[PDB]
Amino acid sequence: MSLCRQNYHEECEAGVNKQINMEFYASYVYMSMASHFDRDDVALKGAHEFFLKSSSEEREHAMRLIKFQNQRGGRVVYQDIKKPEKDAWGTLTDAMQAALDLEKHVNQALLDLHALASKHNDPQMCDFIENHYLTEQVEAIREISGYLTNLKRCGPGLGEFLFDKELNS
């Protein structure tokens, strides 16, 4: 018949629907971090822009998965996007730590999704994941890890202000 599906396993489809939810979740977390550093009583512009950009990127990550679902002839199925764990994210160091944890969680899920596609012998899906996600996670995690190291080096108060400018401000 006339559908495009070929070599695309139901467990893979379901995994992509889960990863779509996880990317939107990460986008939502970063959104909340951004609004937290734009409070009059926090007021760190660099972090605000940096997390707003991160939230927009994660949204793109989701949308590319959504597209891939449809390209493969799967069926996108949405779930609720759960609110983030906190309403207030602490200092810039606290938020970076949380962001590191979030990215590492997203990366584990992509590694699991990749493990799924190879188990099912879907080399196009594996390639997709490697091409658009895995090196990108590696760069993002390394990047945030260096931020943590420098925030600890700079220390609180003035160091936090000056470090915040270097994000991009």
Tell me if 103 is assigned to a ligand binding site: yes
Query: How many residues of this chain bind Fe ion (CB under 5 A)?
Result: 4
Binding to Fe ion, residues 113-152 (CB under 5 A): 140
Q: At what angle do helices 135-154 and 158-167 cross, to 10 degrees?
A: 150
61 touches, from Cu ion, a second copy, Fe ion, none (C-beta below 5 to 8 Å by class)? Fe ion
Residues 6+ apart with CB under 8 A from 57: none
Site string for a second copy, 106-145 (x = CB under 8 A): -xx--x--xx--x--x-xx-xxxxxx--xx-xxx-xx-xx
Contact 148, 140 (CB under 8 A): no
| 9 contact choice in a second copy, Fe ion, Cu ion, none (CB below 5 to 8 Å, kind-dependent) | Cu ion
Q: Which of 139, 130, 158, 112 lies closest to 54 in space, CA to CA?
A: 139
Backbone torsions φ then ψ of 79, nearest 5 degrees:
-125, 170
**Both ends of the chain: CA-CA distance in Å?**
55
Query: Which of 16, 22, 163, 167 touches a second copy by CB under 8 A?
Result: 163
User: Closest-CB residue for Fe ion?
Assistant: 61
* Residue list 51-80, contact with Fe ion (CB under 5 A): 58, 61
137 labelled binding-site residue: yes
136 is in an annotated binding site: yes
Virtual torsion, Cα 21, 85, 32, 59, nearest 10 deg: -10
Could you tell me the smallest distance in angstroms from the CB atom of residue 21 to Cu ion? 19
Name the residues that contact Fe ion, by CB under 5 A: 23, 58, 61, 140
